[model samples]
Every structure is written in C-alpha cells, then in structure tokens.
Target: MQNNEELPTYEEAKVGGGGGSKVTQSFLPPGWEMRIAPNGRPFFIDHNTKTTTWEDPRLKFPVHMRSK
Candidate 1:
C-alpha cells in the first residue's frame, strides 16, 4: 500500500485559512509556524519569544478597517 500524499506536510504546512492558503514567505522568521483555527481564524506562534498571537508580527502595520 502507498501512503497518502495529499496529507498536509512538506517543507511547509497550512492551517486552513478561510479565503486562501498560506504561502511560505521568506520574510517569516525562523522557528515560526502559521496556525489557523477551524473557524478560519489566523493564528501565529513564536517559539523564539514563547508567545502566541492572533496577528502576524511580520506585518508591522496591520490593517483592521473597512473604511478609508
């Protein structure tokens, strides 16, 4: 029998983003993993800092507005 190749895991992984899949960006620091919730919530982890956040620290200026 053969193994399931469709399983999530390679050089990178995704946590089921709502609208799109996570593209492994070079800007992402080492020892970091992008985790998403079943509700399509974007979650992030920082092993270096031992901290967890809903926002990505990589994005210095996060946008949280639907208005201009």
Candidate 2:
C-alpha cells in the first residue's frame, strides 16, 4: 500500500480498481474497503477520512434514474 502522502490522486485511483472488488484484498491499504449494497452498487470506504463515495457505474448515476 502506498503511503497516504504518496497515495494517488482520486482520478488516478479510480481508473485502477479504486472502489472495485480488486481493491478489497488483504494487500490493500489500511482503512480502505469495498462495499456493495443490496441494489448491487459498489463504493469505497475510507475509514481514515470517514468518507464514502460511489465507484461502480450502477451507483454513480443521478437519483432520478429510478423514476425515468
């Protein structure tokens, strides 16, 4: 795992399994985990930052999609 100071930028991370299952392995960085909701959406869990963000395309769309 790269040091926090050396961590790649968000855009760089996203392109290489940022929030995907590939990032959930034991070798991944600390406090980082991948989560999938009941609706089959993927996201990232950053415990150090206490932030959660969607990563999968299924979870990245606008809320109005369900109504469309």
Candidate 3:
C-alpha cells in the first residue's frame, strides 16, 4: 500500500470523496476501489485474491466554524 504521506490532502481528498475529483486505480497490493456517495463520503471497496471488503470513511467535524 502507498504510504499515508503519498495520500492526498484533506481538502483534495474531500473533493475526491464528493465524486468531483477524477477516479484513478492504484497498483499497490490488495486492490481496492473508491466511490463517492451523494452525501460526500468516500466509500472503499477492498479486494483480496479471494475476498472483498467494503468500508466508508469515518468522518466527524464540528458544524460551528467559530468559537465564542
């Protein structure tokens, strides 16, 4: 798998998570796929040589932008 450092930034990742970014495949081991949901969460589909697994990004953020 590619190192986390090689991964895209949070904002960039968010764009991809929203289906606005281009889709690309990785050549790393344990192949996986990514797709965006209407709600803007990146869904992950992982495939092994025999089995497959699916995942969704666990996201949590405060809605309020400012603190009093």
Best by TM-score: 1
Worst 10 residues of 1 by lDDT: 1-10
Candidate 2 Cα outliers beyond 4 Å, as residue runs? 1-31, 56-68
The prediction achieving the highest lDDT against the true structure is: 1
* Residue 14 CA displacement from its true place in model 1, Å: 12
TM-score of each predicted structure versus truth = 0.37, 0.33, 0.27
**Top-down lDDT ranking:** 1, 2, 3
Ranked by TM-score from best down, the candidates are 1, 2, 3
* Candidate 1 clash pair list: none
What are the runs in model 1 whose C-alpha is more than 4 Å off?
1-30, 61-68
TM-score: which is higher, 1 or 2? 1
Question: What lDDT is reached at residue 47 by model 1?
Answer: 51
